[PDB]
C-alpha cells in the first residue's frame, strides 16, 4: 500500500516548507516577534501527516500486494472471509445522551449534573465495550 | 472552546487584550474557520463531477 | 478631594454616558436618571459588576467587576456630589468597612431575615423564582458591605429599607446571619443544593433504587 | 500467512494524528502569553521546583517498558503476563497523578492559581488537559483487563491491548514535550 | 465609463483613495473579461451540442489532452502575477506614515459612542503651533504582591490618550470632527472596551480600533496626506460590537486652512463644539446623519 503512504508525506512536504517559511519571514520585517500562533499550528500539521505517513509506509512494507492493490486481479481471489460487524446496538444513543447531559451540565455550571454525566458517560461507554463479550448467565 | 469556556467559568487570563489575546482568538478560530468552508465545496465539486459524463454519453 | 472628583467623571462619560445621559438625566426608553441615587447605589452597582449593563431583557445579571477600587470610589464620588443620596459605610482608615458591619446577634437577625428576605430568597439564603424572566440571587457570594448597600438602595426589583424602617442594628444583625447561614457546614452529610424535597426525591429514585434493582438483578434470574 | 492490514490499528493511529492539533491550541496560547511577558516570564510567587517533577517523569517513563512488555506477552497468547504488566502500568500511571496533585496543592498554597495571573492560566490549562487524558488512560486500562476474563483470549483481545497501549505512548510522549517546554526552557 | 464599471464607490476625496479607485476599476474589468470568456463557452455547448433526433453511435470518448491542460494552468498564473504586484505597489503607498505630519488626532471608541482629540497642531507655513497632550490626566489610569499580567490588573488604562480638547458624543448628538483642508492629517486609534470599526467611506479606508493595540503588534495609527475637498461626510461603525453596533455613526466637517484657527481659538476660549462651527458660520449640527430615536421601536407607545 504505496499511495496511500505516498498521499500523506506529498503532504508532510508542503506543509514543512510553509511553516519554515512562515518562521523565517515573520522574525525579520514583521511587527512583534515570529508570530507564536500560526507558527505553532503548521509544525503540528506537519507532525499529524508524518505519524500517519510513517505509519502506512512500515505497514507497506510489512505485508505483501493485495488484490486491491493488483492491476489485473479477479474477483475470485477475494473470496473467503471479511471479518465481523455488528448488525445492531442500541448503546450509541445512550452514549449520546450521556454527553448531552455532561455538556448541558458544564454550560450552566451545575457541578451535580456534571458528575451524574460523568457517571453516564462511563457507564454507556462500559455497556458498549461489553457487549460481544458477555457470557451465559450462571443460574 | 475549551479555553472561551475556561475564562467564562474559572475567570482566567487567556483572552485578555492586555495579554496579546485579542488576536490570539482571531488567529485560531481562521486557522479552523477557511478550512471549514473547503470541507463543504469538495464533496459537491465530486457530485456535479459524477453527474457530468452521465449526461453527456462521453 | 477635587482630584477624586474630576477622575471620576472622565470615567463616567467614556463608559456610562450613553444608557444614563451626560447630565446623569437619563436616556429615554435607554436608561433611568441618576440624581440622588448616592455612591450607595453605585457602589452596589460597579462592585458586583451589574453595571456597565449590554442589553435590555428581563434582568440585567451579574458579572467580573470592571474597575477596581479607586476607581469605584471616584465614580462614587462624582455621582455623590450631583444629587445626593445614600452613602457606604466607612472605617476608622476611611476604607470600606467589612468586618464592623457584622451585628452580634444573631438570633434576631435570623427571624428578621425570615419575615422579610426569605419569601424572595431561600431558607438559608439560596435562589428563587420570580414573574417572568425574574430572580431573587444566591447570596452566598456577597461582602457585608454589599449585604448591607442592597436593601439600602432596592437595587432593580428587591424592595427599598431605609434607616427609619431597619435601623443599622438590625441591618448588621441580618448580616450577621446571612454571612454564617453561608459559612457553616452540612451537619448530617452532604447538603445536596439545600432545597429540600426535589433534590431529595431525585437523588433517591437516581441512587437508592439503582441500586435496589441492580441488587435484584445481580440475585434474580432473567427469561 | 498475514496479508492484511489492521484496520482497528489504522484507526486508532488516524485518531492520535487528529488528537495531537487539540494540544496546538494550548500550545499556541503558553508561546503567545510567555511572549508578552517583558521581564521574568515565571512572576515573583512562581517558584518552579525540580524535586518532584523530575521523579514524576521518571515513573512516567518507565511506564511505557512495561506497557511494551505487555503487548510483547499478548502476542503470544500469554494471558496472565499481560494482566501483570497492565497492573504495574496502572500503578505507576496513578503515582504520576497523585504526584501531579501534590504538586498542584503545593503551588496553589504558595499563590500561584488559574485567576491570579497570566501565567498561572496557561500552565493549569495545558497540564490539566494532560492529566484528563492520563486517567483516560487509566479507564482504559480498567476496562481492557475487566473484558480480558469474559471470554477466551482470542486475537481481537490482542488487538485491543496493542491499541490502548499505542494510546498511552501518545500520554507520554506529550509529557516528554511539555516537560521539556516549561521546565527548561523558562 | 467610471460610473458604471466601478460597482458605486464613491469618489475620492484623498490622492489615496483616487489611485485605489484605479486599481478597482482595472481588476473589475480584467475579472469581467474572464466572466464573459467562460460564460460564452458554457452557453455555446448548451445551445450546439445536444441529442438529435436522427442521433445513433455515442460520441467519440475522449477525455485527454496533454498539451492543453498545461497551456490553460498557465494563463492564470501570468494574470494573477501583474494583480499581485499592482497590489503591492498599490498597498505599499497606503501606508507611508511621513514623520511630521500638520495635525495629529486622538480617536477613542468606546461602548457605543466616539470622542475625538486634537493632539498637536504644526502648519508647514509655521503660523499655527498648538500642543494638547496632557500627560497630568494621563497618570490617573494605573493599577497594581504582583499584578496578573506583567505586575498590573486588567484595569489599568493607561494606554488610553488626553488631550486638552475634547469633542464628545452623546445619545442625542453626533459627533462631529473639523478638520483643515490641504493637510496632512494622522489618526491614531485606541479603544476602552471593544473592537470597533473607523470607516470613512469617502477615504476608502477603514481600520479596527483594538482595546491593546501595542500588546497584540497591530498598527493603531494612519495618515492622510491631504484633504482637497471641503464640506460634511459620514462616518460609521463596521465591526461588531453589541446592541448599538448599527446607531454609533459620526461625521467629519472639512474647512478652510484659516477657519481652522478661529474654530480652535473659539474651543479654547471655553465654548462648545455647536457655539464655535455656529462662530465660524457653520450648522452647529451634523447634516448628513441624525441621531436615532431613543425609543426601542414603532410597537411602543
Ligand atoms: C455513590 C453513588 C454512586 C453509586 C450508587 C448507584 C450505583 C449502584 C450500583 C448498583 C449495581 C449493583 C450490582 C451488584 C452486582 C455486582 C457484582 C457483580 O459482579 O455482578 C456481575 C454481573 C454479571 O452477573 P449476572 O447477574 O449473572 O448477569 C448476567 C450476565 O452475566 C450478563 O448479561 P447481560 O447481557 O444482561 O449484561 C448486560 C449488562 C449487565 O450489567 C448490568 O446488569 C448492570 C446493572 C445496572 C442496573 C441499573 C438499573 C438501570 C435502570 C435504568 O451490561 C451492562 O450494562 C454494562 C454496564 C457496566 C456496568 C457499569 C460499570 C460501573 C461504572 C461505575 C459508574 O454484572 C454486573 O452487574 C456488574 C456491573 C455492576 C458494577 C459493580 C461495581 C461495584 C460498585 C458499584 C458502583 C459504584
Ligand atoms: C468507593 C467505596 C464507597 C463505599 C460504597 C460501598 C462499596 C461496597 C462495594 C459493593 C458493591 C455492591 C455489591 C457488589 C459486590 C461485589 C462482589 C463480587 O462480585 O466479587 C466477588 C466475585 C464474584 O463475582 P460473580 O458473581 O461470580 O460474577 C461473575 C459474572 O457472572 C460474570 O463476570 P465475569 O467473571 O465473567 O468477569 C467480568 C468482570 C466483572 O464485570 C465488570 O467488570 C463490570 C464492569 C465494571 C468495571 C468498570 C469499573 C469502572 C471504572 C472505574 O470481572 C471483573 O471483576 C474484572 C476483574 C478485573 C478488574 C480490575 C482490573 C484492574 C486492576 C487494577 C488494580 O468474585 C470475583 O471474581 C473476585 C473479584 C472480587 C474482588 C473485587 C471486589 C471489590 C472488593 C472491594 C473490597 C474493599
Ligand atoms: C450504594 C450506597 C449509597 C450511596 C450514598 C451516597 C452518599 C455519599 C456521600 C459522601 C460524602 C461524605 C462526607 C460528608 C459530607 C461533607 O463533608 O460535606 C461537605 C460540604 O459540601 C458542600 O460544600 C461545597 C463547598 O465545600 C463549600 O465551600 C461551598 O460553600 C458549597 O456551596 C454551597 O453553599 C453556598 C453558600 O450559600 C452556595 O453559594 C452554593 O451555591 C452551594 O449551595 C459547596 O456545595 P456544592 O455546590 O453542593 O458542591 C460541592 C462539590 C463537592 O462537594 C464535596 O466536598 C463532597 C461531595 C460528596 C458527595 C458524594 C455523593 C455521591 C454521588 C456521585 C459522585 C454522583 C454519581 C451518581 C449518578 C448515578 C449512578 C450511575 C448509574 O461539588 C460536587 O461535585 C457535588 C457532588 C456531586 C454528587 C452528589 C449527588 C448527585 C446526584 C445526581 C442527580 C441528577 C440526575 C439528573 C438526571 C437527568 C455543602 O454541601 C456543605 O454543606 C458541606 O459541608
Ligand atoms: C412543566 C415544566 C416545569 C417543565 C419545563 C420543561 C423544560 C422547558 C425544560 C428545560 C430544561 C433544560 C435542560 C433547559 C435548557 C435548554 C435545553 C438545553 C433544553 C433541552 C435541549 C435538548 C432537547 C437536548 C437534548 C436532550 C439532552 C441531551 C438532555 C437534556 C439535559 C437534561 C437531561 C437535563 C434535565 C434534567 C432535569 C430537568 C432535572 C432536574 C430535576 C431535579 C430534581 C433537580 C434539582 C436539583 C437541584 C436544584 C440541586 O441543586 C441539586 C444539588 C445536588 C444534587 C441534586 C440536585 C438536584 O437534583
Ligand atoms: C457606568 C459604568 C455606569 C454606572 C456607574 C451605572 N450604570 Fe447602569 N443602568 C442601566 C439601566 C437600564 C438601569 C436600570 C435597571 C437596572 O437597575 O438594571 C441601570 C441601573 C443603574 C444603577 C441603579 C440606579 C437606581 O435607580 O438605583 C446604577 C447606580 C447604575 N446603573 C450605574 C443601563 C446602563 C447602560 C446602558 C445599557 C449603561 C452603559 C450603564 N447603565 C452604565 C452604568
Ligand atoms: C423580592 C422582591 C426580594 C426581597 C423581599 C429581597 N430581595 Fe434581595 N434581591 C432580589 C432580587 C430580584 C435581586 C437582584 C437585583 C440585582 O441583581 O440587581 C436581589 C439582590 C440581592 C442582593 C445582591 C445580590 C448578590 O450580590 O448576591 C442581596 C445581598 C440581597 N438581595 C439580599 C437581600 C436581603 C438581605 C433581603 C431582606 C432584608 C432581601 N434581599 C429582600 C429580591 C428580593
Ligand atoms: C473548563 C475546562 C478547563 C479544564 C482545565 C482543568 C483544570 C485543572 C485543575 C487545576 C487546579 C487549579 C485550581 C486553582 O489553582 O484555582 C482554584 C480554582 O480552580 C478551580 O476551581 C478548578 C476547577 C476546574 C474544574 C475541573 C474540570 C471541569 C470539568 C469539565 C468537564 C467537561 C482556586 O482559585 P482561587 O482560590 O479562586 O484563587
Ligand atoms: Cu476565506
Ligand atoms: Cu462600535
Ligand atoms: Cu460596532
Same mark, same amino acid.
Given at each position: 500500500?504505496?499511495?496511500?503512504?505516498?498521499?500523506?508525506?506529498?503532504?508532510?512536504?508542503?506543509?514543512?516548507?510553509?511553516?519554515?517559511?512562515?518562521?523565517?519571514?515573520?522574525?525579520?520585517?514583521?511587527?512583534?516577534?515570529?508570530?507564536?500562533?500560526?507558527?505553532?499550528?503548521?509544525?503540528?500539521?506537519?507532525?499529524?501527516?508524518?505519524?500517519?505517513?510513517?505509519?502506512?509506509?512500515?505497514?507497506?512494507?510489512?505485508?505483501?500486494?493485495?488484490?486491491?492493490?493488483?492491476?489485473?486481479?479477479?474477483?475470485?481471489?477475494?473470496?473467503?472471509?471479511?471479518?465481523?460487524?455488528?448488525?445492531?446496538?442500541?448503546?450509541?444513543?445512550?452514549?449520546?445522551?450521556?454527553?448531552?447531559?455532561?455538556?448541558?451540565?458544564?454550560?450552566?455550571?451545575?457541578?451535580?449534573?456534571?458528575?451524574?454525566?460523568?457517571?453516564?458517560?462511563?457507564?454507556?461507554?462500559?455497556?458498549?465495550?461489553?457487549?460481544?463479550?458477555?457470557?451465559?448467565?450462571?443460574? | 472552546?475549551?479555553?472561551?469556556?475556561?475564562?467564562?467559568?474559572?475567570?482566567?487570563?487567556?483572552?485578555?487584550?492586555?495579554?496579546?489575546?485579542?488576536?490570539?482568538?482571531?488567529?485560531?478560530?481562521?486557522?479552523?474557520?477557511?478550512?471549514?468552508?473547503?470541507?463543504?465545496?469538495?464533496?459537491?465539486?465530486?457530485?456535479?463531477?459524477?453527474?457530468?459524463?452521465?449526461?453527456?454519453?462521453? | 478631594?477635587?482630584?477624586?472628583?474630576?477622575?471620576?467623571?472622565?470615567?463616567?462619560?467614556?463608559?456610562?454616558?450613553?444608557?444614563?445621559?451626560?447630565?446623569?438625566?437619563?436616556?429615554?426608553?435607554?436608561?433611568?436618571?441618576?440624581?440622588?441615587?448616592?455612591?450607595?447605589?453605585?457602589?452596589?452597582?460597579?462592585?458586583?459588576?451589574?453595571?456597565?449593563?449590554?442589553?435590555?431583557?428581563?434582568?440585567?445579571?451579574?458579572?467580573?467587576?470592571?474597575?477596581?477600587?479607586?476607581?469605584?470610589?471616584?465614580?462614587?464620588?462624582?455621582?455623590?456630589?450631583?444629587?445626593?443620596?445614600?452613602?457606604?459605610?466607612?472605617?476608622?482608615?476611611?476604607?470600606?468597612?467589612?468586618?464592623?458591619?457584622?451585628?452580634?446577634?444573631?438570633?434576631?437577625?435570623?427571624?428578621?431575615?425570615?419575615?422579610?428576605?426569605?419569601?424572595?430568597?431561600?431558607?438559608?439564603?439560596?435562589?428563587?423564582?420570580?414573574?417572568?424572566?425574574?430572580?431573587?440571587?444566591?447570596?452566598?457570594?456577597?461582602?457585608?458591605?454589599?449585604?448591607?448597600?442592597?436593601?439600602?438602595?432596592?437595587?432593580?426589583?428587591?424592595?427599598?429599607?431605609?434607616?427609619?424602617?431597619?435601623?443599622?442594628?438590625?441591618?448588621?444583625?441580618?448580616?450577621?446571619?446571612?454571612?454564617?447561614?453561608?459559612?457553616?457546614?452540612?451537619?448530617?452529610?452532604?447538603?445536596?443544593?439545600?432545597?429540600?424535597?426535589?433534590?431529595?426525591?431525585?437523588?433517591?429514585?437516581?441512587?437508592?433504587?439503582?441500586?435496589?434493582?441492580?441488587?435484584?438483578?445481580?440475585?434474580?434470574?432473567?427469561? | 500467512?498475514?496479508?492484511?492490514?489492521?484496520?482497528?490499528?489504522?484507526?486508532?493511529?488516524?485518531?492520535?494524528?487528529?488528537?495531537?492539533?487539540?494540544?496546538?491550541?494550548?500550545?499556541?496560547?503558553?508561546?503567545?502569553?510567555?511572549?508578552?511577558?517583558?521581564?521574568?516570564?515565571?512572576?515573583?510567587?512562581?517558584?518552579?521546583?525540580?524535586?518532584?517533577?523530575?521523579?514524576?517523569?521518571?515513573?512516567?517513563?518507565?511506564?511505557?517498558?512495561?506497557?511494551?512488555?505487555?503487548?510483547?506477552?499478548?502476542?503470544?497468547?500469554?494471558?496472565?503476563?499481560?494482566?501483570?504488566?497492565?497492573?504495574?502500568?496502572?500503578?505507576?500511571?496513578?503515582?504520576?497523578?497523585?504526584?501531579?496533585?501534590?504538586?498542584?496543592?503545593?503551588?496553589?498554597?504558595?499563590?500561584?492559581?488559574?485567576?491570579?495571573?497570566?501565567?498561572?492560566?496557561?500552565?493549569?490549562?495545558?497540564?490539566?488537559?494532560?492529566?484528563?487524558?492520563?486517567?483516560?488512560?487509566?479507564?482504559?486500562?480498567?476496562?481492557?483487563?475487566?473484558?480480558?476474563?469474559?471470554?477466551?483470549?482470542?486475537?481481537?483481545?490482542?488487538?485491543?491491548?496493542?491499541?490502548?497501549?499505542?494510546?498511552?505512548?501518545?500520554?507520554?510522549? *506529550?509529557?516528554?514535550?511539555?516537560?521539556?517546554?516549561?521546565?527548561?526552557?523558562? | 465609463?467610471?460610473?458604471?464599471?466601478?460597482?458605486?464607490?464613491?469618489?475620492?476625496?484623498?490622492?489615496?483613495?483616487?489611485?485605489?479607485?484605479?486599481?478597482?476599476?482595472?481588476?473589475?474589468?480584467?475579472?469581467?473579461?474572464?466572466?464573459?470568456?467562460?460564460?460564452?463557452?458554457?452557453?455555446?455547448?448548451?445551445?450546439?451540442?445536444?441529442?438529435?433526433?436522427?442521433?445513433?453511435?455515442?460520441?467519440?470518448?475522449?477525455?485527454?489532452?496533454?498539451?492543453?491542460?498545461?497551456?490553460?494552468?498557465?494563463?492564470?498564473?501570468?494574470?494573477?502575477?501583474?494583480?499581485?504586484?499592482?497590489?503591492?505597489?498599490?498597498?505599499?503607498?497606503?501606508?507611508?506614515?511621513?514623520?511630521?505630519?500638520?495635525?495629529?488626532?486622538?480617536?477613542?471608541?468606546?461602548?457605543?459612542?466616539?470622542?475625538?482629540?486634537?493632539?498637536?497642531?504644526?502648519?508647514?507655513?509655521?503660523?499655527?503651533?498648538?500642543?494638547?497632550?496632557?500627560?497630568?490626566?494621563?497618570?490617573?489610569?494605573?493599577?497594581?504582591?504582583?499584578?496578573?499580567?506583567?505586575?498590573?490588573?486588567?484595569?489599568?488604562?493607561?494606554?488610553?490618550?488626553?488631550?486638552?480638547?475634547?469633542?464628545?458624543?452623546?445619545?442625542?448628538?453626533?459627533?462631529?470632527?473639523?478638520?483643515?483642508?490641504?493637510?496632512?492629517?494622522?489618526?491614531?486609534?485606541?479603544?476602552?472596551? *471593544?473592537?470597533?470599526?473607523?470607516?470613512?467611506?469617502?477615504?476608502?479606508?477603514?481600520?479596527? *480600533?483594538?482595546?491593546?493595540?501595542?500588546?497584540?503588534?497591530?498598527?493603531? *495609527?494612519?495618515?492622510?496626506?491631504?484633504?482637497?475637498?471641503?464640506?460634511?461626510?459620514?462616518?460609521?461603525?463596521?465591526?461588531?460590537?453589541?446592541?448599538?453596533?448599527?446607531?454609533?455613526?459620526?461625521?467629519?466637517?472639512?474647512?478652510?486652512?484659516?477657519?481652522?484657527?478661529?474654530?480652535?481659538?473659539?474651543?479654547?476660549?471655553?465654548?462648545?463644539?455647536?457655539?464655535?462651527?455656529?462662530?465660524?458660520?457653520?450648522?452647529?449640527?451634523?447634516?448628513?446623519?441624525?441621531?436615532?430615536?431613543?425609543?426601542?421601536?414603532?410597537?411602543?407607545?
Amino acid at each position: 500500500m504505496h499511495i496511500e503512504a505516498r498521499l500523506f508525506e506529498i503532504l508532510t512536504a508542503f506543509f514543512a516548507l510553509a511553516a519554515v517559511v512562515y518562521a523565517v519571514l515573520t522574525a525579520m520585517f514583521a511587527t512583534g516577534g515570529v508570530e507564536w500562533a500560526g507558527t505553532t499550528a503548521l509544525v503540528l500539521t506537519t507532525g499529524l501527516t508524518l505519524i500517519t505517513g510513517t505509519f502506512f509506509r512500515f505497514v507497506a512494507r510489512r505485508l505483501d500486494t493485495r488484490p486491491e492493490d493488483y492491476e489485473d486481479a479477479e474477483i475470485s481471489d477475494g473470496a473467503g472471509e471479511l471479518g465481523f460487524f455488528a448488525p445492531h446496538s442500541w448503546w450509541p444513543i445512550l452514549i449520546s445522551l450521556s454527553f448531552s447531559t455532561a455538556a448541558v451540565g458544564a454550560a450552566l455550571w451545575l457541578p451535580w449534573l456534571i458528575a451524574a454525566g460523568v457517571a453516564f458517560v462511563i457507564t454507556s461507554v462500559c455497556g458498549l465495550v461489553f457487549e460481544y463479550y458477555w457470557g451465559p448467565e450462571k443460574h | 472552546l475549551f479555553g472561551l469556556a475556561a475564562d467564562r467559568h474559572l475567570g482566567a487570563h487567556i483572552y485578555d487584550p492586555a495579554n496579546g489575546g485579542v488576536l490570539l482568538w482571531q488567529h485560531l478560530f481562521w486557522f479552523f474557520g477557511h478550512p471549514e468552508v473547503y470541507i463543504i465545496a469538495l464533496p459537491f465539486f465530486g457530485i456535479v463531477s459524477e453527474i457530468f459524463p452521465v449526461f453527456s454519453r462521453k | 478631594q477635587s482630584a477624586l472628583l474630576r477622575t471620576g467623571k472622565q470615567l463616567f462619560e467614556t463608559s456610562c454616558v450613553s444608557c444614563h445621559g451626560a447630565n446623569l438625566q437619563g436616556v429615554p426608553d435607554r436608561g433611568p436618571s441618576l440624581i440622588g441615587t448616592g455612591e450607595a447605589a453605585v457602589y452596589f452597582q460597579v462592585s458586583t459588576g451589574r453595571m456597565p449593563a449590554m442589553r435590555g431583557e428581563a434582568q440585567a445579571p451579574s458579572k467580573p467587576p470592571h474597575f477596581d477600587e479607586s476607581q469605584i470610589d471616584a465614580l462614587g464620588a462624582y455621582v455623590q456630589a450631583n444629587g445626593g443620596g445614600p452613602t457606604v459605610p466607612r472605617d476608622d482608615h476611611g476604607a470600606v468597612a467589612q468586618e464592623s458591619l457584622i451585628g452580634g446577634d444573631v438570633a434576631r437577625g435570623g427571624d428578621l431575615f425570615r419575615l422579610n428576605c426569605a419569601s424572595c430568597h431561600n431558607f438559608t439564603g439560596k435562589g428563587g423564582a420570580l414573574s417572568s424572566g425574574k430572580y431573587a440571587p444566591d447570596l452566598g457570594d456577597a461582602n457585608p458591605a454589599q449585604i448591607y448597600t442592597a436593601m439600602l438602595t432596592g437595587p432593580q426589583n428587591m424592595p427599598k429599607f431605609s434607616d427609619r424602617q431597619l435601623t443599622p442594628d438590625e441591618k448588621r444583625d441580618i448580616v450577621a446571619y446571612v454571612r454564617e447561614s453561608a459559612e457553616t457546614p452540612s451537619y448530617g452529610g452532604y447538603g445536596l443544593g439545600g432545597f429540600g424535597p426535589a433534590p431529595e426525591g431525585m437523588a433517591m429514585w437516581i441512587i437508592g433504587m439503582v441500586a435496589a434493582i441492580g441488587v435484584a438483578m445481580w440475585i434474580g434470574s432473567r427469561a | 500467512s498475514l496479508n492484511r492490514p489492521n484496520m482497528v490499528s489504522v484507526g486508532t493511529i488516524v485518531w492520535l494524528s487528529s488528537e495531537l492539533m487539540f494540544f496546538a491550541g494550548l500550545f499556541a496560547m503558553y508561546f503567545t502569553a510567555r511572549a508578552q511577558a517583558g521581564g521574568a516570564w515565571p512572576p515573583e510567587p512562581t517558584e518552579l521546583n525540580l524535586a518532584l517533577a523530575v521523579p514524576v517523569t521518571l515513573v512516567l517513563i518507565a511506564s511505557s517498558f512495561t506497557c511494551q512488555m505487555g503487548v510483547f506477552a499478548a502476542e503470544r497468547g500469554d494471558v496472565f503476563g499481560l494482566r501483570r504488566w497492565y497492573v504495574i502500568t496502572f500503578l505507576m500511571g496513578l503515582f504520576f497523578v497523585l504526584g501531579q496533585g501534590y504538586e498542584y496543592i503545593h503551588l496553589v498554597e504558595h499563590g500561584t492559581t488559574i485567576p491570579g495571573s497570566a501565567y498561572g492560566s496557561v500552565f493549569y490549562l495545558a497540564t490539566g488537559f494532560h492529566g484528563l487524558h492520563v486517567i483516560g488512560g487509566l479507564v482504559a486500562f480498567v476496562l481492557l483487563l475487566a473484558r480480558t476474563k469474559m471470554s477466551k483470549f482470542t486475537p481481537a483481545q490482542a488487538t485491543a491491548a496493542i491499541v490502548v497501549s499505542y494510546y498511552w505512548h501518545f500520554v507520554d510522549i *506529550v509529557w516528554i514535550a511539555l516537560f521539556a517546554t516549561i521546565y527548561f526552557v523558562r | 465609463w467610471s460610473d458604471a464599471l466601478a460597482l458605486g464607490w464613491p469618489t475620492g476625496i484623498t490622492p489615496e483613495a483616487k489611485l485605489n479607485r484605479e486599481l478597482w476599476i482595472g481588476s473589475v474589468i480584467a475579472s469581467f473579461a474572464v466572466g464573459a470568456i467562460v460564460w460564452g463557452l458554457i452557453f455555446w455547448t448548451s445551445a450546439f451540442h445536444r441529442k438529435k433526433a436522427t442521433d445513433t453511435e455515442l460520441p467519440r470518448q475522449f477525455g485527454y489532452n496533454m498539451p492543453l491542460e498545461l497551456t490553460l494552468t498557465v494563463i492564470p498564473f501570468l494574470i494573477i502575477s501583474v494583480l499581485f504586484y499592482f497590489t503591492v505597489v498599490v498597498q505599499e503607498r497606503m501606508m507611508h506614515k511621513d514623520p511630521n505630519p500638520e495635525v495629529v488626532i486622538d480617536v477613542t471608541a468606546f461602548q457605543w459612542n466616539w470622542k475625538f482629540g486634537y493632539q498637536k497642531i504644526a502648519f508647514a507655513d509655521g503660523s499655527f503651533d498648538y500642543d494638547g497632550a496632557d500627560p497630568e490626566r494621563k497618570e490617573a489610569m494605573t493599577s497594581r504582591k504582583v499584578g496578573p499580567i506583567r505586575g498590573m490588573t486588567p484595569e489599568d488604562r493607561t494606554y488610553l490618550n488626553f488631550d486638552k480638547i475634547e469633542t464628545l458624543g452623546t445619545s442625542s448628538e453626533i459627533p462631529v470632527l473639523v478638520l483643515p483642508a490641504g493637510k496632512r492629517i494622522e489618526f491614531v486609534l485606541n479603544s476602552a472596551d *471593544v473592537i470597533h470599526g473607523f470607516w470613512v467611506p469617502e477615504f476608502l479606508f477603514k481600520r479596527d *480600533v483594538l482595546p491593546e493595540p501595542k500588546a497584540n503588534n497591530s498598527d493603531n *495609527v494612519f495618515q492622510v496626506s491631504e484633504i482637497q475637498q471641503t464640506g460634511a461626510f459620514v462616518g460609521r461603525c463596521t465591526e461588531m460590537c453589541g446592541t448599538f453596533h448599527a446607531m454609533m455613526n459620526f461625521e467629519v466637517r472639512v474647512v478652510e486652512p484659516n477657519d481652522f484657527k478661529a474654530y480652535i481659538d473659539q474651543r479654547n476660549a471655553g465654548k462648545t463644539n455647536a457655539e464655535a462651527l455656529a462662530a465660524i458660520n457653520q450648522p452647529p449640527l451634523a447634516i448628513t446623519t441624525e441621531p436615532f430615536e431613543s425609543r426601542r421601536g414603532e410597537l411602543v407607545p
